[PDB]
Design a protein around this ligand. Structure first.
Ligand SMILES: CCCCCCC(CCCCCC)(CO[C@H]1O[C@@H](CO)[C@H](O)[C@@H](O)[C@@H]1O)CO[C@H]1O[C@@H](CO)[C@H](O)[C@@H](O)[C@@H]1O
Ligand SMILES: CCCCCCC(CCCCCC)(CO[C@H]1O[C@@H](CO)[C@H](O)[C@@H](O)[C@@H]1O)CO[C@H]1O[C@@H](CO)[C@H](O)[C@@H](O)[C@@H]1O
Ligand SMILES: CCCCCCC(CCCCCC)(CO[C@H]1O[C@@H](CO)[C@H](O)[C@@H](O)[C@@H]1O)CO[C@H]1O[C@@H](CO)[C@H](O)[C@@H](O)[C@@H]1O
Ligand SMILES: CCCCCCC(CCCCCC)(CO[C@H]1O[C@@H](CO)[C@H](O)[C@@H](O)[C@@H]1O)CO[C@H]1O[C@@H](CO)[C@H](O)[C@@H](O)[C@@H]1O
Ligand SMILES: CCCCCCC(CCCCCC)(CO[C@H]1O[C@@H](CO)[C@H](O)[C@@H](O)[C@@H]1O)CO[C@H]1O[C@@H](CO)[C@H](O)[C@@H](O)[C@@H]1O
Ligand SMILES: CCCCCCC(CCCCCC)(CO[C@H]1O[C@@H](CO)[C@H](O)[C@@H](O)[C@@H]1O)CO[C@H]1O[C@@H](CO)[C@H](O)[C@@H](O)[C@@H]1O
Ligand SMILES: CC(C)CCC[C@@H](C)[C@H]1CC[C@H]2[C@@H]3CC=C4C[C@@H](OC(=O)CCC(=O)O)CC[C@]4(C)[C@H]3CC[C@]12C
Length: 457
């Protein structure tokens, strides 16, 4: 059963997903207004005026530093989750959200570009830690038969976060010359609501029984969250996981690549992050505004509604169809839209067909490669290696996002419309990889998933 206790716990957790989505998508709309600020602050200092190269570098640094923070943050989740707990770690890192949000919110008043760059770094550190905390907590408090459905709420949170950031970035909302510090500082508000709500959420009963050896405390939480007495099966299941973890050495990031039974789920974990970040989703949105102009922010907001609708579609299908099926349909459908893009963009100079290709690509992305890579890593591992594995998988997601972001304008300049062909090459490669290497985890236990990798190795 799904009690209001479970819905509340997962909703409060997904505020971190929204934070990641908001901070990712917020920085694009105030570009011209923030560049003007950087230029005014630096010129008013009294020295020689800044060069266009320096001004573009500081803008690029303001954007990119968030990815650097996220890389460090996502890779650092293991320094928190076992030490403090999953619930308590989420609470502790709101101190980074508040410091990050204050730096960005006060950089204009302080007439400081240093505060803006530090603010984006610290919010990067926070979002990075979130991207690993949220799926870990959701993956451990969710009933095994709905682990994927609740897992998809991480991506729903992210997608809604981007959308709100894009809406708020409008001139008549917070995208103004006077209100842009509030636009960046907005991240403080979900952080204060999450902080006030988190002490009312339970700690992971998997964590309490396996890591903290609190069997009764875990049983009471499980009884409340699932609103039953039949928690005896799940408790014994956690006792068999606790047994395994005490028999195995403490799992370090290096051990995941050395131990054969961890090598297969970690290659799966990393490659599924690459399948999301190298799908062509960055390219589809890059060319989006240009295509809408030929036939634009209100249309970009329109792409956000499609993005939201199809994440909800995935949520209602992932427990029926399974992860393997939805990930494959997603990659396949995107490959069909990827080739249709190349033909549309070369024959455009049919913008109506290219708008359709973008809309259907987003629809396919959100069916599988969008939500699945975020929650799948928690399913492929048991308690012992889960934090280390989510540190590696999370860092892989942030690093591949960062490297695609740096190399893509250069690739789009030299290849043009033909840039969607190398994405069709990637999509088919990940479509093949999912078919032969990714096992179905739908409705299965962490112990059943682990026993299967231990049998294969
Ligand atoms: C826009 C909604 C604002 C209200 C906020 C809703 C809030 C939040 C408290 C924590 C966050 C603090 C910011 C209190 O809300 C309730 O609190 C009662 C107090 O007696 C009120 O009488 C009642 O009207 C109100 O809805 C709901 O709390 C509870 O929700 C349960 C699931 O449903 C949870 O199982 C439970 O662990 C939690 O504790
Ligand atoms: C962006 C600028 C600040 C960077 C800070 C990086 C951070 C903490 C990250 C915490 C997350 C953010 C709140 C990584 O540090 C940790 O990183 C872990 C991997 O993630 C390692 O497993 C762990 O051994 C290491 O201490 C601390 O860095 C250094 O800390 C030194 C002792 O102040 C350590 O002697 C040194 O070694 C470490 O380099
Ligand atoms: C949610 C609250 C988290 C607070 C974490 C504080 C933070 C990282 C700050 C990173 C953010 C700033 C960009 C302080 O570290 C800071 O220490 C300063 C002074 O030495 C340094 O100037 C600064 O560079 C460094 O990041 C912890 O880092 C390290 O502290 C060591 C202490 O023994 C720990 O052995 C080590 O495990 C830890 O990893
Ligand atoms: C919410 C932020 C909390 C951190 C505080 C940081 C803050 C004050 C922020 C401005 C606040 C505007 C309402 C003081 O911070 C320092 O203050 C010194 C004493 O003044 C202390 O000795 C030192 O330990 C402390 O770090 C210094 O940061 C910035 O201040 C700018 C002044 O316009 C500077 O142009 C800028 O370049 C600097 O980067
Ligand atoms: C209106 C003109 C302002 C120019 C300021 C340039 C800026 C800071 C960037 C400003 C924005 C801060 C958010 C570049 O600084 C960068 O320079 C890079 C290359 O050398 C370094 O790799 C990097 O670490 C450094 O931060 C500081 O560098 C200068 O600092 C002077 C002491 O204040 C030094 O006397 C001078 O000799 C140095 O040149
Ligand atoms: C610190 C800031 C103020 C809020 C404090 C929240 C409050 C008390 C409210 C009265 C909610 O606490 C209750 O919340 C219920 C859900 O609504 C739970 O069913 C119940 O078990 C829990 O104690 C205390 O919660 C914490 O209590 C710790 C033991 O002192 C627990 O180790 C911790 O994990 C728990 O989070
Ligand atoms: C546009 C294209 C070129 C992007 C795809 C790049 C990938 C090949 C990169 C991006 C993310 C990378 C991963 C990011 C993080 C790590 C963890 C890293 O672990 C350590 O270095 C251990 C650190 C320690 O001592 O704790 C090993 C490599 C790995 C898996 C990286 C392998 C290579 C990946 C998949």
């Amino acid at each position: 059963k799904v009690t209001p206790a479970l819905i509340f716990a997962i909703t409060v957790a997904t505020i971190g997903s929204f934070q990641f989505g908001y901070n990712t998508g917020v920085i694009n709309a105030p570009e011209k207004i923030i560049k003007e600020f950087i230029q005014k602050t630096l010129t008013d200092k009294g020295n020689a005026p800044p060069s266009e190269v320096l001004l573009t570098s500081l803008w690029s640094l303001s954007v990119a530093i968030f990815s650097v923070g996220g890389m460090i943050g996502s890779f650092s989740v293991g320094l928190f989750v076992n030490r403090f707990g999953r619930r308590n770690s989420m609470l502790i890192v709101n101190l980074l959200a508040v410091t990050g949000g204050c730096f960005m919110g006060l950089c204009k008043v302080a007439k400081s570009v240093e505060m803006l760059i530090l603010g984006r770094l610290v919010i990067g550190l926070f979002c990075g830690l979130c991207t690993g905390f949220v799926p870990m907590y959701i993956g451990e408090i969710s009933p095994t038969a709905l682990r994927g459905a609740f897992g998809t709420l991480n991506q729903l949170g992210i997608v809604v976060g981007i959308l709100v950031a894009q809406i708020f970035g409008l001139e008549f909302i917070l995208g103004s010359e006077e209100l842009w510090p509030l636009l960046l500082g907005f991240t403080i508000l979900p952080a204060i609501l999450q902080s006030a709500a988190l002490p009312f959420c339970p700690e992971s009963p998997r964590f309490l029984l396996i890591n903290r050896k609190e069997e009764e405390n875990a049983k009471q939480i499980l009884q409340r969250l699932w609103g039953t007495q039949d928690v005896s099966q799940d408790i014994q299941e956690m006792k068999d996981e606790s047994a395994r973890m005490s028999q195995e050495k403490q799992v370090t990031v290096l051990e995941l690549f050395r131990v054969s039974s961890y090598r297969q789920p970690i290659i799966i974990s990393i490659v599924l992050q690459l399948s999301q970040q190298l799908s062509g989703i960055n390219a589809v949105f890059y060319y989006s505004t240009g295509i809408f102009k030929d036939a634009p922010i209100y249309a970009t907001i329109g792409a956000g509604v499609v993005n939201t609708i199809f994440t909800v579609v995935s949520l209602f299908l992932v427990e029926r169809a399974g992860r393997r099926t939805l990930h494959m349909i997603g990659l396949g459908g995107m490959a069909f839209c990827s080739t249709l893009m190349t033909v549309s963009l070369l024959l455009k100079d049919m913008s109506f067909v290219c708008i359709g290709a973008i809309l259907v690509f987003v629809a396919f992305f959100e069916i599988g490669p969008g939500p699945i890579p975020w929650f799948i890593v928690a399913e492929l591992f048991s308690q012992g290696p889960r934090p280390a594995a989510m540190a590696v998988a999370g860092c892989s997601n942030w690093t591949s996002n960062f490297l695609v972001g740096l190399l893509f304008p250069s690739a789009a300049h030299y290849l043009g419309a033909y840039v969607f062909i190398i994405f069709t090459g990637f999509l088919i490669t990940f479509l093949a990889f999912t078919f032969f290497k990714v096992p179905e985890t739908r409705g299965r236990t962490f112990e059943d998933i682990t026993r299967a990798f231990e049998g294969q190795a």
